[PDB]
Amino acid sequence: QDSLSFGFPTFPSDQKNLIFQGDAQIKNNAVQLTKTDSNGNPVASTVGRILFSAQVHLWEKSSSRVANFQSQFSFSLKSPLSNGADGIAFFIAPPDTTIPSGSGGGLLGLFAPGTAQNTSANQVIAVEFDTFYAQDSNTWDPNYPHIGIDVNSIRSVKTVKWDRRDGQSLNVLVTFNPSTRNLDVVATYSDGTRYEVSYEVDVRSVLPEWVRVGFSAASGEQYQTHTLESWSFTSTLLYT
Amino acid sequence: QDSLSFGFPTFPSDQKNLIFQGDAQIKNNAVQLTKTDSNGNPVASTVGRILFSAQVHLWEKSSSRVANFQSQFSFSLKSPLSNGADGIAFFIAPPDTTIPSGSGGGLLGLFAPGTAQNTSANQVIAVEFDTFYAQDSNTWDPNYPHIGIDVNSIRSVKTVKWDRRDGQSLNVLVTFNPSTRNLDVVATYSDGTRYEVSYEVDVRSVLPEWVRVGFSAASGEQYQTHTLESWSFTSTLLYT
Numbered sequence A, B: 001q002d003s004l005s006f007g008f009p010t011f012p013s014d015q016k017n018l019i020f021q022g023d024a025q026i027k028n029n030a031v032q033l034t035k036t037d038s039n040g041n042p043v044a045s046t047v048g049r050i051l052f053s054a055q056v057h058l059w060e061k062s063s064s065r066v067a068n069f070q071s072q073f074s075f076s077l078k079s080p081l082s083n084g085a086d087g088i089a090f091f092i093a094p095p096d097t098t099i100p101s102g103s104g105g106g107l108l109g110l111f112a113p114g115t116a117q118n119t120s121a122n123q124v125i126a127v128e129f130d131t132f133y134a135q136d137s138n139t140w141d142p143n144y145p146h147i148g149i150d151v152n153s154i155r156s157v158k159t160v161k162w163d164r165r166d167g168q169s170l171n172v173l174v175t176f177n178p179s180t181r182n183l184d185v186v187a188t189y190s191d192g193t194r195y196e197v198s199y200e201v202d203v204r205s206v207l208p209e210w211v212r213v214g215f216s217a218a219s220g221e222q223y224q225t226h227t228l229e230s231w232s233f234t235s236t237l238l239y240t
């Protein structure tokens, strides 16, 4: 289909169109990307991702069209630790994408250690909300919590300072306009605090015509829950 | 998802989200539900169906919600003859639906011979565009071409006389309103000729909470092409 849209105001346990990978599962009408014990407390060494089952037609070589898409979602992070890790990301990748071996912790379940910073070895666009930046392990990160745009590498092509707020929901709108090739990210907390970051990228040179969209999160030695609360997505092929 | 929508203005050959059953295949940017020869001419004894891969949440027992839905599509029928058969139908059924054994010809690939008129043995709602009504084989049909609403039986609960026009595209709009429980069908030819048929039905007592939507067509001894040219669908779970 040239156009596709879907909306999850909440996430009931009865799901049919979501692909669950790793430890991701539904609990209390929300998606818990990372594992939690019986009491709902976060645990270390966990990775989980979800993908919508239907493939999205991102661009069409034959017709020279590229999709205009928008992804709106909200999530919350919670941890009794002073340095919860590692973060959550909205991503777009080839339909057969699976969790890379050893992609835990700071790799957010998106990249393999050996090629995490090799742009020619990956096919993924992601918007990360990174809460762990220890310069000793996450050497590629700026020294503060941040929102980053990742294009085929864990070392973001761009980042902006972000404030992690325990237990508070962050509303995010990610948009891509094929006319300007601008990928815009706008995130807000309920008190009006706003974060914005944009990057120009030709998705045709990074991703295949058909892709899947979803979320990924991970916790290494440090941990926190990564709770996806709602998600709506829409895409439509347009003439460029 | 509480809401889902998709649109196929045309049908390019590289499809990813369509389930093809029987003889259905893409040819010339359109879906040919029934088999055709090398020169594109219709052949006898053929059945074909397509279903969208993502499941639709028609109703939810927990929230007591029921979805409204709208399906818009256009198709054309062509035959060297005139008594083209057998017809095409838009249908909704359980996700694991497959072509029933011996459902060719007048059964439109939707019902099994032994239970075609047994409402307690089927789970399907369909809007049929029936062009063959010979009483020797289609005893359940009125004596003329027609559009009918089928609820668990090949014997339509409601029909309206219809005119078959070789090679002309018929634009159809099917809508279900959960508030009134009315399933409305409006079909029109380019010159404005309009056909309307409606029926009140509680989808909750006929179909499971999750379903798949699609099209089916068949040709027994008489034949014609059943070409699906475009299709858009949208559904939203609502409180009533």
Ligand SMILES: CO[C@H]1O[C@H](CO)[C@@H](O)[C@H](O[C@H]2O[C@H](CO)[C@@H](O)[C@H](O)[C@@H]2O)[C@@H]1O
Binding pocket: A085, A086, A104, A105, A106, A107, A132, A134, A136, A137, A138, A219, A220, A221, A222, A223
């Ligand atoms: C206390 O953990 C920090 O220090 C440890 C010892 O140097 C590191 O092993 C550890 O790295 C792992 O956890 C972080 C945070 O979850 C993660 O980003 C990294 O990829 C490792 O999984 C961390 O630096």
Ligand SMILES: CO[C@H]1O[C@H](CO)[C@@H](O)[C@H](O[C@H]2O[C@H](CO)[C@@H](O)[C@H](O)[C@@H]2O)[C@@H]1O
Binding pocket: B085, B086, B104, B105, B106, B107, B132, B134, B136, B137, B138, B219, B220, B221, B222, B223
């Ligand atoms: C000439 O075909 C008509 O008469 C035949 C002899 O009685 C029938 O077998 C035949 O029925 C089959 O074809 C029709 C039209 O395709 C179909 O509706 C029916 O299910 C049988 O397949 C038809 O009545």
Ligand SMILES: [Ca+2]
Binding pocket: A086, A087, A106, A130, A131, A132, A133, A138, A141
């Ligand atoms: Ca990090």
Ligand SMILES: [Ca+2]
Binding pocket: B086, B106, B130, B131, B132, B133, B138, B141
């Ligand atoms: Ca018939």
Ligand SMILES: [Mn+2]
Binding pocket: A128, A130, A140, A141, A142, A148, A154, A156
């Ligand atoms: Mn980072």
Ligand SMILES: [Mn+2]
Binding pocket: B128, B130, B140, B141, B142, B148, B154, B156
């Ligand atoms: Mn009929």
